[PDB]
Amino acid sequence: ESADLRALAKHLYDSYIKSFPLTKAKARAILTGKTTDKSPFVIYDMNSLMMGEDKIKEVAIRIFQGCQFRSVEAVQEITEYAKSIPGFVNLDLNDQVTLLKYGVHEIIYTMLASLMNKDGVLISEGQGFMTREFLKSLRKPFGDFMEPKFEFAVKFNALELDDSDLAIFIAVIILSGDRPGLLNVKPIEDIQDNLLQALELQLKLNHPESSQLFAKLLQKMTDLRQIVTEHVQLLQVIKKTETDMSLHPLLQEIYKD
Ligand SMILES: CCCCCCCC/C=C\CCCCCCCC(=O)O
Numbered sequence: 001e002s003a004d005l006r007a008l009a010k011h012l013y014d015s016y017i018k019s020f021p022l023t024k025a026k027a028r029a030i031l032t033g034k035t036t037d038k039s040p041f042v043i044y045d046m047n048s049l050m051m052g053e054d055k056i057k058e059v060a061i062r063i064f065q066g067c068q069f070r071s072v073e074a075v076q077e078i079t080e081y082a083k084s085i086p087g088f089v090n091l092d093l094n095d096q097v098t099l100l101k102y103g104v105h106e107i108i109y110t111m112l113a114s115l116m117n118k119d120g121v122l123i124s125e126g127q128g129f130m131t132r133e134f135l136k137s138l139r140k141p142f143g144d145f146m147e148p149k150f151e152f153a154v155k156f157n158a159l160e161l162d163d164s165d166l167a168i169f170i171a172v173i174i175l176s177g178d179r180p181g182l183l184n185v186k187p188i189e190d191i192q193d194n195l196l197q198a199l200e201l202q203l204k205l206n207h208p209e210s211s212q213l214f215a216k217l218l219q220k221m222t223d224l225r226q227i228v229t230e231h232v233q234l235l236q237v238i239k240k241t242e243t244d245m246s247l248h249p250l251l252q253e254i255y256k257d
Contacts, residue, residue: 016167024114
């Protein structure tokens with residue numbers, strides 16, 4: 001019954017709003033710097049960076065550890081969103097951990113696209129805007145940490161998804177079932193099928209003119225996988241080049257290679 005799929009879409013959108021303080025709709029109102037009620041301060045070099053906390057260790061490391069704390073906060077938000085996905089908390093506890101362990105970064109890069117345009121990325125809840133060129137000029141091991149996310153984002157953002165689309169989509173991601181180590185794949189897959197059914201109807205109704213958006217969105221889930229592996233490879237390099245630099249445990253636990 002399609003009525004039950006709209007109810008599910010509505011439930012997930014509502015819970016997405018409640019779980020994620022900075023939505024795509026807000027991010028776009030800020031980036032399209034004409035709804036000029038709170039425009040961001042723009043960090044594009046190191047002096048602007050120093051004026052940054054005049055409004056909002058080494059600089060590459062300092063930025064890296066700020067991005068690190070923001071991912072920790074993002075994991076907390078995604079985890080709270082996951083508990084609202086119907087059936088998720090009824091799954092075996094080990095599979096809950098495993099679904100979050102693998103789904104969390106794919107979601108993070110999906111949502112981080114909402115905060116990006118080709119030029120840069122919103123930061124500090126939207127108060128700031130760090131330019132892509134600045135991040136790309138960062139010292140050696142760090143300058144290329146964000147570029148593949150920007151590359152994904154400019155293409156993903158071309159789908160023109162809105163938050164109500166994304167709420168279903170990140171739910172689909174969490175409930176994969178092809179994750180390594182899942183103890184009971186079948187109840188996961190049944191939840192995902194209902195989610196997939198809900199996404200499909202949602203894209204049909206929300207984007208009637210956008211041909212095969214559902215297929216094209218599902219195909220973006222391979223871009224996400226590659227971002228993750230590239231990232232964990234980049235982390236291993238940092239763990240050995242800077243043995244003085246601490247990684248948050250929540251993020252350490254998520255990263256089991
Ligand atoms: C430092 C985070 C401030 C607390 C709330 C943050 C709200 C979410 C938005 C941006 C987080 C700030 C990111 C800090 C610099 C890293 C750049 C990045 O990769 O996003």
